[PDB]
Design an enzyme around this catalytic site. Structure first.
Site, PDB file in Angstrom:
ATOM      1  N   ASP B 139      -1.153  -3.126 -18.375  1.00  0.00           N
ATOM      2  CA  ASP B 139      -1.349  -4.559 -18.701  1.00  0.00           C
ATOM      3  C   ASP B 139      -1.424  -4.727 -20.229  1.00  0.00           C
ATOM      4  O   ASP B 139      -1.595  -3.721 -20.913  1.00  0.00           O
ATOM      5  CB  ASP B 139      -2.571  -5.080 -17.958  1.00  0.00           C
ATOM      6  CG  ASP B 139      -2.461  -6.519 -17.509  1.00  0.00           C
ATOM      7  OD1 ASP B 139      -1.692  -7.267 -18.111  1.00  0.00           O
ATOM      8  OD2 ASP B 139      -3.293  -6.926 -16.417  1.00  0.00           O
ATOM      9  N   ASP B 200       0.473 -14.210 -13.829  1.00  0.00           N
ATOM     10  CA  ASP B 200      -0.105 -13.652 -12.582  1.00  0.00           C
ATOM     11  C   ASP B 200       0.123 -14.622 -11.419  1.00  0.00           C
ATOM     12  O   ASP B 200      -0.116 -15.828 -11.550  1.00  0.00           O
ATOM     13  CB  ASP B 200      -1.589 -13.351 -12.763  1.00  0.00           C
ATOM     14  CG  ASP B 200      -1.887 -12.346 -13.868  1.00  0.00           C
ATOM     15  OD1 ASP B 200      -0.924 -11.834 -14.499  1.00  0.00           O
ATOM     16  OD2 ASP B 200      -3.082 -12.071 -14.073  1.00  0.00           O
TER      17      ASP B 200
HETATM   18  C1  LIG Z   1      -3.119  -8.269 -16.022  1.00  0.00           C
HETATM   19  O1  LIG Z   1      -4.360 -10.133 -15.674  1.00  0.00           O
HETATM   20  C2  LIG Z   1      -4.486  -8.722 -15.562  1.00  0.00           C
HETATM   21  C3  LIG Z   1      -4.904  -8.283 -14.165  1.00  0.00           C
HETATM   22  C4  LIG Z   1      -5.869  -7.109 -14.220  1.00  0.00           C
HETATM   23  O2  LIG Z   1      -7.030  -7.469 -14.956  1.00  0.00           O
HETATM   24  C5  LIG Z   1      -3.736  -7.936 -13.231  1.00  0.00           C
HETATM   25  O3  LIG Z   1      -3.358  -6.539 -13.351  1.00  0.00           O
HETATM   26  C6  LIG Z   1      -2.549  -8.810 -13.556  1.00  0.00           C
HETATM   27  O4  LIG Z   1      -1.559  -8.598 -12.555  1.00  0.00           O
HETATM   28  C7  LIG Z   1      -2.035  -8.368 -14.927  1.00  0.00           C
HETATM   29  O5  LIG Z   1      -1.018  -9.253 -15.339  1.00  0.00           O
END
Ligand SMILES: *[C@]12O[C@H]1[C@H](CO)[C@H](O)[C@H](O)[C@H]2O
Ligand SMILES: *[C@@H]1O[C@H](CO)[C@@H](O[C@@H]2O[C@H](CO)[C@@H](O[C@@H]3O[C@H](CO)[C@@H](O)[C@H](O[C@H]4O[C@H](CO)[C@@H](O)[C@H](O)[C@@H]4O)[C@@H]3O)[C@H](O)[C@H]2NC(C)=O)[C@H](O)[C@H]1NC(C)=O
Ligand SMILES: *[C@@H]1O[C@H](CO)[C@@H](O[C@@H]2O[C@H](CO)[C@@H](O[C@@H]3O[C@H](CO)[C@@H](O)[C@H](O)[C@@H]3O)[C@H](O)[C@H]2NC(C)=O)[C@H](O)[C@H]1NC(C)=O
Ligand SMILES: *[C@@H]1O[C@H](CO)[C@@H](O[C@@H]2O[C@H](CO)[C@@H](O[C@@H]3O[C@H](CO)[C@@H](O)[C@H](O)[C@@H]3O)[C@H](O)[C@H]2NC(C)=O)[C@H](O)[C@H]1NC(C)=O
Ligand SMILES: *[C@@H]1O[C@H](CO)[C@@H](O[C@@H]2O[C@H](CO)[C@@H](O)[C@H](O)[C@H]2NC(C)=O)[C@H](O)[C@H]1NC(C)=O
Ligand SMILES: *[C@@H]1O[C@H](CO)[C@@H](O[C@@H]2O[C@H](CO)[C@@H](O)[C@H](O)[C@H]2NC(C)=O)[C@H](O)[C@H]1NC(C)=O
Ligand SMILES: *[C@@H]1O[C@H](CO)[C@@H](O)[C@H](O)[C@H]1NC(C)=O
Ligand SMILES: *[C@]12O[C@H]1[C@H](CO)[C@H](O)[C@H](O)[C@H]2O
Lengths: 392, 390
Positions: B139, B200
């Site tokens: 991420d 997301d």
């Molecule tokens: C990263 O908003 C974050 C979250 C984990 O904290 C998820 O993995 C999400 O899919 C990713 O974009």
């Protein structure tokens, strides 16, 4: 409206959301606005348990009319799509034990562009009465200022009265007033058995949310004016169609019962899942909607993407709805002091709590001092019935 | 990324959308982020037919880490929630013939506030390799510059390679760059097996539509760079949760197949309807997603609140998806000349058409002159497979 009708919220089926203004009987015969559609919907209301559950009114919305009035100034059924006319459909609908609703517009044209009642309030009202019409839905498009809107809605009301036929009168007076000035619900209530407040529903969770958020934002203005003979109309039930998840369907049924909404299904009774059917025919949730006390519920609490609504029922019972507005993750825990529900009346000195939605489960006796702990699905609702009791 | 992995889009299960950052094992032991959750999902992936259908990577997302690195500067599993540790979890997952995914962040912290990998790229890579990790999702939170973002994604890419272990590398480089400057997808692909493009996903039809709309808007930039070893990642399948109607679930499954998307379920495999299970295990639709040609599909047409998407397949086959974006009324009629489909080649001189979604139905032989007529449910999709007659 003191016409002796709608002592509980009107229950039935209305074509608009599902079938809209489909005039193409050649290429879309199964979905076109035709007598055959209503005749078939009528049969299935009898044979598939809908009338038994309380859905009594088979209602025609916009696009039943011929493009022009007859030589004698009357409205006409479309000759191609309704060749046997309203009178004979009324006979068919009455022969099954059901009542028939029809549609018109206060202004110069119906929203779909068909003949308005701008004049003719009196002849139209009389035409419907001759036909056997048991309900009128009266939309507000193509209307020439506040003065006419008000005058038209008030005129058709007296006109239907002067026919001396029992006709549930369904108005959109408040909805078409907002653009000019705030409605006056005491006046509207005098003239109308129920009144649309907000924009037409469609087959979407966004549409449900926007209706609930408008209702709760505006609840101090609309909740107390509702009661036997006059209801707030948050628009049609869209359960059994395409746009709502099981949870969002449970939310609509739960909260239409909380709001003492009329229950007009707009779906295809010929193609409906057993799950949707069981939900729309749920005896216990219909019983909350149809509660003879006839006091509209309201939003008690909002915060942390949770909502708590409750509704007072006859005999010291309360319905409670818990909504999860978080559209991510899993079922969320919500806990509340049973004392905080039903204005501290419901569980003084005890509650017996039955879960009705999403499934029916006896939860047992709660002391006035108890906590109620539940888990609520994203975009779903838990619906509870609280029965005041001396025992335990 | 030429590491010999993700030759078809990666399939499995990822905790994030359904289970999120639930650290409450006291009050919620059956949905907190714990090695028991992952063991349960592993057993069901085997026992309930998920593995047989191609769901192979069982993946940990954010909130698996202890709050602090160890004395040797390494990432640690939370000692209470992952008491046997990641290597041992990897051992268990491997014993069922599955692969383990884990999560880290290119910046100073993870999005949920746990240790970031900035300054620890090489050790973090070696740690994961030693543990038997088969996939890394990386991420982009808490990264102060585009230089650090690019350098970090490239550096981790090279560090994973240098461990010697086959590790699928899932990046969010484009997503975190996009606000500031147009990403170079040719470069991203050299370093990444798949790459998150967009915000997301959540458990809503609004989210689905917005992902599709972003993808169709940006298709000139992203479609051609996709292929064996490097995929556009439009985020998790949310089929089997709470927010999608049946028709919206069909739309997600149909279009993740058209888009040659990675298929990462984020659901509860312990509590999923027969309908949701049969859609997610639909062998004909997974065969489209998993087509060995690996050519991403695209939006052909948009108009009258309809969309037509198509994807070229192995052996002169095409997938076609028709979406009804009108959220009112009933099944709406859509017709298209089959000559307009698959660039004029699908149905010249003829094609056999099979409907796959919402139900499997042979429609029959269509001539080059023919028009396909379909009724499509509001927020639903009709998915067809076209087989050229030669
Ligand atoms: C990263 O908003 C974050 C979250 C984990 O904290 C998820 O993995 C999400 O899919 C990713 O974009
Ligand atoms: C045209 O408008 C007039 C003007 O209002 C309207 O007359 C009203 O009709 C209502 C409904 O019948 C009358 O209300 C009833 O009054 C009688 C006599 O007191 C009662 O029998 C009725 O009681 C019923 O409802 C009770 C619950 O409230 C039940 O307990 C009981 O079982 C009964 O079912 C009811 O209160 C009202 O008296 C008249 N008012 C006047 C001024 O005449 C008329 O009906 C309209 N006509 C049409 C066809 O629209
Ligand atoms: C580290 O990076 C290198 C260089 O990118 C990777 O090498 C590449 O590996 C693939 C897969 O092993 C090679 O192609 C394939 O070769 C196999 C066997 O010969 C064959 O069966 C396949 O059909 C395909 O041709 C690829 O050519 C190779 N590239 C180079 C320049 O050597 C390596 O895989 C990476 N290692 C790790 C641990 O990620
Ligand atoms: C993770 O956190 C560390 C520490 O807070 C970050 O290091 C710092 O990065 C900033 C850049 O944003 C550096 O500031 C720069 O200083 C020079 C002059 O020294 C100035 O000309 C630049 O314009 C800029 O302001 C800072 O020096 C540096 N500090 C340390 C201790 O190295 C690090 O970049 C963060 N990593 C990520 C990827 O966010
Ligand atoms: C809103 O409408 C109600 C009902 O028309 C109004 O209240 C009545 O007004 C009439 C005519 O002025 C009086 O004869 C009645 O005594 C009033 N009460 C009832 C219950 O009938 C009210 O004044 C209107 N306007 C506002 C601002 O409330
Ligand atoms: C986008 O990134 C790619 C790959 O990093 C760049 O393409 C390379 O261009 C250089 C010239 O600087 C060549 O040496 C390489 O052969 C290219 N690599 C590949 C595999 O094509 C490209 O320059 C970048 N594009 C832009 C517009 O910046
Ligand atoms: C209908 O149209 C006439 C003019 O043709 C106009 O005078 C009248 O105000 C309109 N009526 C309504 C109710 O809008
Ligand atoms: C009036 O937008 C119109 C329509 C008929 O054309 C429906 O009756 C709708 O419910 C109403 O608001």
């Amino acid at each position: 409206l003191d016409n002796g009708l709608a002592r509980t919220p009107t229950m039935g089926w209305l074509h608009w959301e599902r079938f809209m203004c489909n005039l193409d009987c050649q290429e879309e015969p199964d979905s076109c606005i035709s007598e055959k559609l209503f005749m078939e919907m009528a049969e299935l209301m009898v044979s598939e348990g809908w009338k038994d559950a309380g859905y009594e009114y088979l209602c025609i919305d916009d696009c039943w009319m011929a493009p022009q009035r007859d030589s004698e100034g009357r409205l006409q059924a479309d000759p191609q799509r309704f060749p046997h006319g309203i009178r004979q459909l009324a006979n068919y609908v009455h022969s099954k034990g059901l009542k028939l609703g029809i549609y018109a517009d206060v202004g110069n044209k119906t929203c779909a562009g068909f003949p308005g009642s701008f004049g003719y309030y009196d002849i139209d009202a009389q035409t419907f009465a001759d036909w056997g019409v048991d309900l009128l839905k009266f939309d507000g498009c193509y209307c020439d200022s506040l003065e006419n809107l008000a005058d038209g809605y008030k005129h058709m009301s007296l006109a239907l009265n002067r026919t001396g036929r029992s006709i549930v009168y369904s108005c959109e007076w408040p909805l078409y007033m907002w653009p000019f000035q705030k409605p006056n619900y005491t006046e509207i209530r005098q003239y109308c058995n129920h009144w649309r407040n907000f924009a037409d529903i469609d087959d979407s969770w966004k549409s449900i949310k926007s209706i609930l958020d408008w209702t709760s934002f505006n609840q101090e203005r609309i909740v107390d004016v509702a009661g036997p003979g006059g209801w707030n109309d948050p628009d049609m039930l869209v359960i059994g169609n395409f746009g709502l998840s099981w949870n969002q369907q449970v939310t609509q049924m739960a909260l239409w019962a909380i709001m003492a909404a009329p229950l007009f299904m707009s779906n295809d009774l010929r193609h409906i899942s057993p799950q949707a059917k069981a939900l729309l025919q749920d005896k216990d949730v219909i019983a909350i909607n149809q509660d003879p006390l006839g006091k509209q519920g309201y939003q008690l609490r909002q915060g942390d993407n949770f909502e708590v609504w409750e509704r007072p029922l006859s005999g010291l019972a309360w319905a409670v709805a818990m909504i999860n507005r978080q559209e991510i993750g899993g079922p969320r825990s919500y806990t509340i002091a049973v004392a905080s529900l039903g204005k501290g009346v419901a569980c003084n000195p005890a509650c017996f709590i039955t879960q009705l939605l999403p499934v029916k489960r006896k939860l047992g006796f709660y002391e006035w001092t108890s906590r109620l702990r539940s888990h609520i699905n994203p975009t779903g609702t838990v619906l509870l019935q609280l029965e005041n009791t001396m025992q335990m």
